[PDB]
Design a protein around this ligand. Structure first.
Ligand SMILES: NC(=O)C1=CN([C@@H]2O[C@H](COP(=O)(O)OP(=O)(O)OC[C@H]3O[C@@H](n4cnc5c(N)ncnc54)[C@H](O)[C@@H]3O)[C@@H](O)[C@H]2O)C=CC1
Ligand SMILES: OC[C@H]1O[C@H](O)[C@H](O)[C@@H](O)[C@@H]1O
Ligand SMILES: OC[C@H]1O[C@H](O)[C@H](O)[C@@H](O)[C@@H]1O
Lengths: 331, 321
């Protein structure tokens, strides 16, 4: 137990790499709560925590960030945000080349949650997002409404930024959603884009944006993650992903009831049967408080089935792995 | 050029500290940002991520990435983190001075009215190189280190006394290095001298001496724990708060490396000293009434500045050219 007892929320970051550090920085700056940076790399999270305790002093608050290499640091966590995983193959892009490895990490993490903080609200980030969140849930056995995956907020923010830059309006007033799988089949819902509730079609008809811009933004949204990977040279995005996850955690901690496209457990909704998918939901002090079911048209249902199939395809790969079908002995 | 009403902040160097400061500009809505670096592509990747971040937090702050010094055009503030870094590696200083003079030349050409903050050590050497090539007023350029060191001192006193860091005043002056001087006599708790807390038994002199040493050892402690790299969160935020004080004419007091013309018995060199940063740059340099022991300790930093200037001149004059 690292969290010294006090009034503040206790935020446990399982994974202290690029995104974990970003999120700890945000907690310090926002005075959101005390933080533990947990990692398997020895001492590295203690170095970042020390830097971030200094940062709190820079901005005149006493938020404490702890570093830990022990799962027992999860004791009394109110929120757990997971970025744990192996993210590069030794010797040398897809959100799936390391699934066999990271599925096992997700199950150690889930078991740690079950043991040390079974009542926490859990946000997963580790890719492939929609099946990794399920792996955590099964190992942790937390209620379905107390766990989700961060992806839609990030994908939606990229759609919204591009519309905003095109129209010269604040992103504050661009409503936009990307649903489905956090992957190649992600579905930017171009029909549901609004400018302060005004359908984007009205702006199309006025000549403020044209159908070519719309089509390019649809494509660029799906490509944004890979575009960032290519430019960075090493690793993937971490600023916008960390802030997206932290806003979701803040909505839970302060009962804001804000709406986030998040990977949620569905049984019935969206033609999804007992697995996760990026859909609009409401996050408040009771966890996932509402799942909103859009009135998608036939074309959109067709596109969304591409996302659902991508998730199902991944479930079967995981079934095969767990069943031992993909390996054999020397003999 | 890459840059309206918003302030424009140029970040020369797009490593972790540079990205941290760009992130702060997005979160605080402080101004539009350009991440400059000599590496291709990487600053554009970070800028793309940060443009998405602005939208995550519902604002339109724009971060650009560039490999051309022309991106400094119309910058209101320039924060420099460029340079090559690692016994003694003074052999790297000539190339870093070359880099600094390239930046200063770009400043002279593209944003001569900017307020300039340098983070790359040794600050007296590197700040001067920029200033001389840029030909900017001495009150419009400084180095960041004192704010970082002081924030570390303040944090440790705060943790010991169980009071908010908001209410711990503390300063670390001199040269950022093994001769930095935490002024333990000037520590106050909302203006109350720390000695009153010593006499009352709330903190003892063993605690004080330990904190004096830990403040000097903090940067290396972090390096040792990280394995890779060094601190960048508190350093980045320290620099941005100095830039914000200039941009909003806040007149906040920071220990910064300022050009001295006789204060602290220093002439024509930069040293970490308390100063006031406002809309006119370095508006005031505060001269502390240091006692005898403190001036003696401060002399270690002053000797370090002067010894380093001599060594640099020796290396340059030894070049076959
Ligand atoms: N929309 C989304 O969901 C997005 C997801 N991501 C994903 O987030 C994940 C993390 O990204 P980064 O932070 O950049 O990677 P990173 O490699 O910087 O950090 C991952 C950390 O997890 C640690 N780790 C490994 N096993 C662990 C365990 N059992 N417990 C705790 N920590 C453990 C590693 O030591 C490493 O420090 C990746 O899978 C990445 O693909 C990235 C961007 C967006
Ligand atoms: O991007 C071009 C088109 O692609 C998809 O089919 C979307 O449903 C449509 O709204 C979009 O305009
Ligand atoms: O500033 C003078 C300092 O000298 C030494 O470091 C002592 O440990 C410290 O207590 C004293 O204040």
């Amino acid at each position: 137990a690292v969290f010294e007892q006090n009034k503040r929320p206790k935020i446990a970051l399982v994974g202290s790499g690029m995104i974990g550090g970003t999120m700890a920085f945000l907690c310090s700056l926002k005075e959101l709560g005390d933080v533990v940076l947990f990692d398997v790399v020895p001492n590295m999270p203690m170095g970042k925590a020390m830097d971030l305790c200094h940062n709190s002093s820079v901005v005149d608050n006493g938020i404490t960030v702890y570093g830990s290499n022990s799962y027992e640091c999860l004791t009394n966590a109110d929120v757990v945000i997971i970025t744990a995983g192996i993210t590069k193959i030794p010797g040398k892009w897809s959100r799936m080349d390391l699934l066999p490895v990271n599925i096992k990490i997700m199950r150690e993490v889930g078991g740690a949650i079950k043991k040390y903080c079974p009542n926490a609200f859990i946000i997963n980030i580790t890719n492939p997002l929609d099946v990794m969140v399920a792996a955590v849930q099964e190992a942790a056995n937390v209620p379905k409404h107390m766990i989700c995956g961060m992806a839609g907020m990030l994908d939606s923010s990229r759609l919204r930024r591009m519309i905003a830059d095109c129209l010269h309006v604040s992103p504050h007033d661009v409503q936009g959603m990307v649903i489905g799988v956090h992957g190649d089949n992600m579905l930017p819902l171009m029909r549901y884009i609004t400018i302060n509730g005004i359908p984007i079609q009205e702006f199309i008809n006025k000549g403020l944006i044209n159908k070519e811009d719309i089509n390019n933004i649809y494509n660029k949204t799906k490509q944004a993650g890979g575009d960032i990977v290519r430019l960075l040279g090493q690793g993937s995005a971490y600023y916008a992903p960390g802030t997206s996850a932290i806003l979701m955690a803040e909505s839970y901690l302060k009962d804001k009831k804000r709406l986030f496209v998040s990977s949620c457990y569905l049984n019935g909704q969206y033609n999804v049967n007992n697995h996760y998918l990026g859909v609009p939901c409401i996050i408040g002090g009771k966890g996932i408080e509402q799942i909103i079911e859009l009135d998608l048209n036939q074309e959109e249902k067709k596109l969304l089935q591409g996302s659902i199939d991508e998730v199902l395809e991944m479930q079967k790969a995981i079934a095969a792995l767990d069943a031992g079908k993909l390996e054999h002995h020397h003999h």
